[PDB]
Structures are given as C-alpha cells and as structure tokens.
Amino acid sequence: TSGTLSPLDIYPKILDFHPVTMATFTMTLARVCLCPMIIGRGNDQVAISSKFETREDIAVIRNYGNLLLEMSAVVPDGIVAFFTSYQYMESTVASWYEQGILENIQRNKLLFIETQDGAETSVALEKYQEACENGRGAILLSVARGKVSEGI
Amino acid sequence: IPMDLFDFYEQMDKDEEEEEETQTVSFEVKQEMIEELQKRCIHLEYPLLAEYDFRNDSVNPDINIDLKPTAVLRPYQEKSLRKMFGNGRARSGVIVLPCGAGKSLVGVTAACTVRKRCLVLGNSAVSVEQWKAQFKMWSTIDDSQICRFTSDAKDKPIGCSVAISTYSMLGHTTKRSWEAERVMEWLKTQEWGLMILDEVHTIPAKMFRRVLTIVQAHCKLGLTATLVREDDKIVDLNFLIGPKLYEANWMELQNNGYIAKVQCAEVWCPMSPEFYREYVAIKTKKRILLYTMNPNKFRACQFLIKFHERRNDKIIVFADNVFALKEYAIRLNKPYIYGPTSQGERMQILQNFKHNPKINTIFISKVGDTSFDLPEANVLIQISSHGGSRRQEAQRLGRVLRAKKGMVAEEYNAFFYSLVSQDTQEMAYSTKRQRFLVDQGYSFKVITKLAGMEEEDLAFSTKEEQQQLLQKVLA
Amino acid sequence: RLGMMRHLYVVVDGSRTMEDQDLKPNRLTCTLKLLEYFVEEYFDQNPISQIGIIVTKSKRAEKLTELSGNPRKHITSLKKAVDMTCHGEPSLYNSLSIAMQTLKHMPGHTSREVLIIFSSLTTCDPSNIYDLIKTLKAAKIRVSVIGLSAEVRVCTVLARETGGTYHVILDESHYKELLTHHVSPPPA
C-alpha cells in the first residue's frame, strides 16, 4: 500500500507478479481538495520553453519567480514551495543570502538547505506553526526529495 | 471533380475552362466556361461554404523564410494574431491600430507567422529603417543578409522584414507600381506569394488601386491608423486587400498607469466685426483663412495655451496651413515646425520641448503625419476643422498624448481641443467628428462659452486691431 | 436582560491588510460600520455594562475610547476612526496589557472580556505572548477573536486558553451574525 494507488499497473510491473487487488477504505468528496497547474495567462507569456530550464534565466525570472510572488503575496497563508533541486531554489528566491545580485524574489521566506540538523529542522516547524507566512511547511523553500517530506 | 481543371490569365481577368460550375457567378457570359476579375480570387468563402476546392498546378517549388524566433506584443495585438490563425484568408485582410503603439512589430510578426515569400509595401524609407530596427531579432546572420530594395539598388533574400519597396510611380525606378507584373503571386506569375502593406489607406487611390487590382494576390495583410481620407473610400479596401479583422484598442482598456484618459472637446467660438462680411462674400480658398484667424477664436486658443502653461503642461498646437501656422505662432512667440525647418533646428526645438521646463508650447504643420516621430505632450489644440480625415485627428491625438504624473489612473490627465468658428462651413465637420470619436470610445464634449475670457489680457482688444488683421488676410 | 454587569474591551486590527476590498468598500469600512451596529445592540441587551476601544496599527496600540457605560462615546469613536484608516502591522501584546490593566481593577461578579477583529497573521511585539496568556486565564480575562479568512496558531490558542472563542468570518452577513452572538450575556 501507498495511500492512493488506483491505476494499479506499476506495482504488478515492478513485481512481475499479480497480487489480489482491493480498495479498503471509504473516501470523502473531491471538493475538500483542489490540485492546480500554472503556465501563463496571455499570449506574450513565452518564457517557459524549458529546453534548458537549468540555464533559462528569463524563464526563472518570469512566471517561475514572478507567479510564486504573486500567489504567495495574494494567498497570504502558510505555504511551502517545493523545488526540483537546491540550485533552482537558490536562483528563484534572492533571500537574505543570494547566489547572485541578479535574482527575482523579494519577500520574507525561510530556507531548508543541506546539513539540515534534527534540532534545527524543528525550530523552522515551530516558526511555521506559530505565526506568520514563514517556517518549515510555511513560506519556505525546500527540495521535494529532502527531509521536509517526513512532515510533522 | 477538379482533378483536371485549367485556370488562366487575360490582361486583368481569370478564365476557367471545362468548369465545375462554381457558386456565386454568371454562366455562359460569352462562351461555355466561367470568367472573373483577378481581384475576385479573395472570395474563397463562397466556394468554402459550398464545400468546393482548387489546386495550384502552376506552382514553383523553391525555398522560403523560416524566422523561428518570437517576441511579445500588446494584449489586444496578441489576441489579434491569435484571431488571424483562427479566421484564415477566406475571412481576413486588414488590422487598424495607431502609428505609435507597435504597428511595425505586427508586420514582422504577421510575415514570420504566415511564412511565405514576401513583398513589403511601405510609404517612406524612414519607416523601412524603423522596421529594420524592429526586425533585428529575426534577421538571418544579423547584418549580412538584410538589404533595401528601391530606386537606387536591390540585393539579398531579406531586409526590412522581407523585401520592402515603395508604392511610388514617378518612372521605371519607383518600386512596386512599376514591377507589378514581374514577381509576386504564387498561383500565376508565381515567384512570391505574400503581401504586407504598411499605411494601407495609401493604396485604394484611383491610380494606385491598379497595383492590387492587376493580380490574383493570394495572401494580403494591411496595417493602418488613418484608414481613409475625408471622402471615405473604405468599401473598396474589403475587395482590394480583404475584410477588417480588427479595430478598437480603446484607452478605456489601458488606464491605471498605462497610457492616458483624454478629455476630448470641440470649442464653438463666435464671430467678430467685419470677418463674416467678408466670409459670406468670398467663395474662394482664402475663406478658409477668415474662419481660422477669427480673433474671438484666436483669443480662445491664446486663453487655452495660458491656462495649460500656468499648470506647466506640454502642448502641441496643430495648424493645417503654413500661413496660419506662422500668423498664430509668431504672435504667440512659440517655436514652429514645418517642411522648410531643417533637421538640426527641428531636433533642437523638439529636445527643448521634451526636456526643457521653459519650452512647453510648439506649433506644427501637416508634416507630423506619415512617418514622423512626433514628441510626447499632454495637450493638443487644433486651430481648425481641416480636410485631412477625422480618423487622422484620432491617430494624431493617440500618438502624441500621455498622462501627466501623479494623476496616471484618473478619468482624464491629457486634453484635446478643436476650435470651430460659429456660422461657417467649418461647423459641418462636427456631427461626423463627434460620432466618430464616441464610437472610438472617447469622452467628448462641446464648449460653447468662456466668460473668463472677459477677465484677462488677450489679443485683439479693439476693432482697430481686428481691422489691421482683416486688411492683411484679405490681400 | 438584567442580572450582572459586563466590562468588554473591543480591539480592532488597523494594519495595512484591513484596507483590502475583499469585504465591502474595504475591510476597515465594513468592520467599523457593523461594530457601530453591535455597540448599540449590546448596550440595549446589556443596560448595566461598560466598553473600552483599542486599535493595533503602524506596529503600536492606541486608545480610541476610554472604559465607560455610555454607548454614544463608542459609536462616535468608530465614526472618527474611519477617516484615519489603517496602515502597518499589529501590536497585540501591548493591547492585551492595557486591556489587562483596566480589567484587573473590576470587581468580583462582573465579566472580564476582550473582543478582537483580526485580519493579520502574526504581531510585531517582542515580549513573550505565552506568559501574558497564562496571566489572562489567572486574572479571568476572556479573549475572543473574529478572524478574516485566517487560522494562524498563536491567536487561536490565545483565544481557546483564555476561554474558547476563535471564529472565522467570510462575509458582511457572517460578521453581523458573529457580533450578534457576542451581544448575548453570560450566566449569573
């Protein structure tokens, strides 16, 4: 089991065996959840080709940095921004500690970088649960692979 | 079934042998076959509705432009290219937008999207040079394949867009009128296929119309702000280029920190001793001068300059006639710009007007329209109703006027004025002007009195002064 | 209704977030206008009672009305506040300390109450707010929060620990229902 697994196929694919299948909980309406996607709104919003997303500065600066700032400033709640790597995370949020002078988010968020420490992790989750946008799981950046995935 | 269907050319007509009996035309007009004007090819909807089709067996298979890069246009312009993908040649052919908001970019994008061997028609070499400056992102190997193609030389696959030329017909070395049978057209005389026209109103004139009429011309696009002169030829342009895909771009959709809200006004001015004797008695081209120079109207124009200079607004005053221009401007001791002013002196006056807080009013003649970088201001006064086109008043207003600071999102922050002499042929232009501007979305009003003109120093304070001008004007 | 006497300190969020157009004209205008309607209905339901009015704005606390039994001062103060609006961020700890200082004085059988309208997410105060919440519960000063679209945990604990009234408001109809709930007296 893995919580969800309804399309079923991947587990029998990985096993090379065909388990007995069964769904064995009563679920709740779809309406308590909402699962958005973002890419742009007008026809001039061309900076997201992602032929080299790891190198496309204009694309990082445009809806990748700018939509995050619009969504976070408008939707003022505790929100965690997951990234594919540290290097992306570092480029997207200028933060207090910037990788360059030329980076495109200015807003109070908290970091979650390597050498995470078990005690230091909790400090950031204490901050996010208590108040304000920022903390661990709050307006903070973390790579999706990293420890924040354990949760609280 | 059309798998064998011949189609040909005779002097300005297409004749169709052993036909499929296509909709919407006369039959056996003078032989068993169908015969139309070349220019009728544009009506691809009449067969498309029927479910009929055709083949270009006359084709030539050589190479074409790619221009893979893209750029970002204004929000309605992007909507306007998106529509053109939607509609296709059966239901496309002109776009209308101001001469100061991105028309060059629509032409280079319109050619980069349509992507065919293209001939670009323009009014002026300066506008070719502005296109070139726009087009540098899609230019092949930056500066080693762009060339001009007009009365002095021709070279290379591309240039200001693709090959650009001028409308002109002075002799064999003009540009488009002289060459109109050699190249263009993918379907017959089949070297090229796509036509892009900048300043499109320029072509439907009686001699010029023939450049467009004497071909099948597959794809055609036109771009303009003036669209027509006072006599409205525009029904012809639907046939000649194609139907109008867009018109609007209202300032109502771009207020809060974006362009301007303009309060438009017309000003009715009364008529002072001796000037109507003479207006009523004279039927000749001089009578235009008694209505424009009417001192009660001059005093409104002076009062209006004083009111906006006291607030340090920037003002361009338009005068349709070099006599009128100099008689107003020398009296009000404001610089003027016209044909015979040199470039050196124009660029000094215009740099002074834009940067110097001491130089806040200038006077300009018809030379601002058609390829000219008119400067920014916040106030526009026209001394007369003219005969250039109600639509050119709106192009000129739109390209010149912007919001004054602080107030960048208010109901109005820029001002347009047109001065009219009561009890003259100058009044006739108003019911059209008024209907045109309000249909273009503008707030427009009529001002009929100024009892604060009776509270300050202004010109023409006596009959004797007015008589001194009346004798000069009559001569 | 008669039986006992109430002391209530009305606390309003005058931060920059209160300017926003989400709740009629803007939150500041809609909240003060309904709060004027509440004062007259609470004083009509509770003839022997008192109220005092405090705001948090521009990272400080300010006294809009002193603690008194005449409704007229409080509707006149809510009228006078609308013109000067909202900017900046809360100061909740300093507002609970001035409210505490007035409420501690009051005698044995009267209620101690704080009503807060909250459109922020934290507060600017350095002082340890948990020590002050412990002290509210010892003093018997009850604190209620009506929040706008917001559940930020220190405020919610602070209203639960002091007595059990953290409520969320999503419309002008819902805010009138919430204030009218507070008009209701306590048991005696």
Swiss-Prot record, chain A:
Keyword Cell division: no
Stretches for region Mediates interaction with MMS19: 1-152
Magnesium keyword on record: yes
Any one GO CC term of the record: CAK-ERCC2 complex
Main localization of the protein described in the UniProt heading: nucleus
Molecular function terms, GO-annotated: 4 iron, 4 sulfur cluster binding; 5'-3' DNA helicase activity; ATP binding; ATP hydrolysis activity; damaged DNA binding; DNA helicase activity; metal ion binding; protein-macromolecule adaptor activity
Keywords for this protein: 4Fe-4S, ATP-binding, Cataract, Chromosome partition, Cockayne syndrome, Cytoplasm, Cytoskeleton, Deafness, Disease variant, DNA damage, DNA repair, DNA-binding, Dwarfism, Helicase, Host-virus interaction, Hydrolase, Ichthyosis, Iron, Iron-sulfur, Isomerase, Magnesium, Metal-binding, Nucleotide-binding, Nucleus, Transcription, Transcription regulation, Ubl conjugation, Xeroderma pigmentosum
Subunit annotation: Component of the 7-subunit TFIIH core complex composed of XPB/ERCC3, XPD/ERCC2, GTF2H1, GTF2H2, GTF2H3, GTF2H4 and GTF2H5, which is active in NER. The core complex associates with the 3-subunit CDK-activating kinase (CAK) module composed of CCNH/cyclin H, CDK7 and MNAT1 to form the 10-subunit holoenzyme (holo-TFIIH) active in transcription. Interacts with GTF2H2 (p44) which stimulates the 5'-3' helicase activity of this subunit. Component of the MMXD complex, which includes CIAO1, ERCC2, CIAO2B, MMS19 and SLC25A5. Interacts with CIAO1 and CIAO2B; the interaction WITH CIAO2B is direct.
Protein name: General transcription and DNA repair factor IIH helicase subunit XPD
Source organism: Homo sapiens (Human)
Taxonomic path: Eukaryota, Metazoa, Chordata, Craniata, Vertebrata
Residues of the full protein shown: 457 to 608 of 760
Curated annotation (Swiss-Prot), chain B:
Catalytic activity: Couples ATP hydrolysis with the unwinding of duplex DNA by translocating in the 3'-5' direction; ATP + H2O = ADP + phosphate + H(+)
GO function term, MF aspect, one: promoter-specific chromatin binding
Keywords: ATP-binding, Cockayne syndrome, Deafness, Disease variant, DNA damage, DNA repair, DNA-binding, Dwarfism, Helicase, Host-virus interaction, Hydrolase, Ichthyosis, Isomerase, Nucleotide-binding, Nucleus, Phosphoprotein, Transcription, Transcription regulation, Xeroderma pigmentosum
Chain positions found as Phosphoserine: S443
Mutagenesis or variant effect for Q395A: Very low 3'-5' helicase activity, wild-type ATPase activity, wild-type damaged DNA removal, 80% decreased transcription (all in vitro)
Activity regulation annotation text: ATPase activity is stimulated by TFIIH subunit p52 (GTF2H4). DNA translocase activity by this subunit in TFIIH is stimulated by XPA, ERCC5/XPG and XFP plus ERCC1; translocase activity is sensitive to triptolide which targets this enzyme.
Annotated GO CC locations: nucleoplasm; nucleotide-excision repair factor 3 complex; nucleus; transcription factor TFIID complex; transcription factor TFIIH core complex; transcription factor TFIIH holo complex; transcription preinitiation complex
Domain Helicase C-terminal: 299-459
Enzyme Commission identifier(s): 5.6.2.4
UniProt binding sites for ATP: L97, P98, C99, G100, A101, G102, K103, S104, R399, R402
Domain of life of the source: Eukaryota
Effect after changing K103R: Dominant-negative effect on transcription and NER, induces chromatin collapse, probably has no ATPase activity. No transcriptional activity of the reconstituted TFIIH complex. TFHHI is inactive in DNA repair and in transcription
GO biological process, alphabetically ordered: apoptotic process; DNA repair; DNA topological change; embryonic organ development; hair cell differentiation; nucleotide-excision repair; positive regulation of apoptotic process; protein localization
Motif interval(s): DEVH box: 198-201
Subcellular location: Nucleus
The Helicase ATP-binding domain, residue ranges: 84-245
Family classification: Belongs to the helicase family. RAD25/XPB subfamily.
Included range, full protein: 244 to 718 of 782
From Swiss-Prot, chain C:
Subcellular location: Nucleus
Tissues expressed in: Widely expressed, with higher expression in skeletal muscle.
Domain VWFA as annotated: residue spans: 7-183
Phosphotyrosine modified-residue sites: Y42
Disulfide bridge positions per record: none
Function: Component of the general transcription and DNA repair factor IIH (TFIIH) core complex, which is involved in general and transcription-coupled nucleotide excision repair (NER) of damaged DNA and, when complexed to CAK, in RNA transcription by RNA polymerase II. In NER, TFIIH acts by opening DNA around the lesion to allow the excision of the damaged oligonucleotide and its replacement by a new DNA fragment. In transcription, TFIIH has an essential role in transcription initiation.
Subunit structure: Component of the TFIID-containing RNA polymerase II pre-initiation complex that is composed of TBP and at least GTF2A1, GTF2A2, GTF2E1, GTF2E2, GTF2F1, GTF2H2, GTF2H3, GTF2H4, GTF2H5, GTF2B, TCEA1, ERCC2 and ERCC3. Component of the 7-subunit TFIIH core complex composed of XPB/ERCC3, XPD/ERCC2, GTF2H1, GTF2H2, GTF2H3, GTF2H4 and GTF2H5, which is active in NER. The core complex associates with the 3-subunit CDK-activating kinase (CAK) module composed of CCNH/cyclin H, CDK7 and MNAT1 to form the 10-subunit holoenzyme (holo-TFIIH) active in transcription. (Microbial infection) Interacts with varicella-zoster virus IE63 protein.
Protein name: General transcription factor IIH subunit 2
Residues of the full protein shown: 54 to 241 of 395
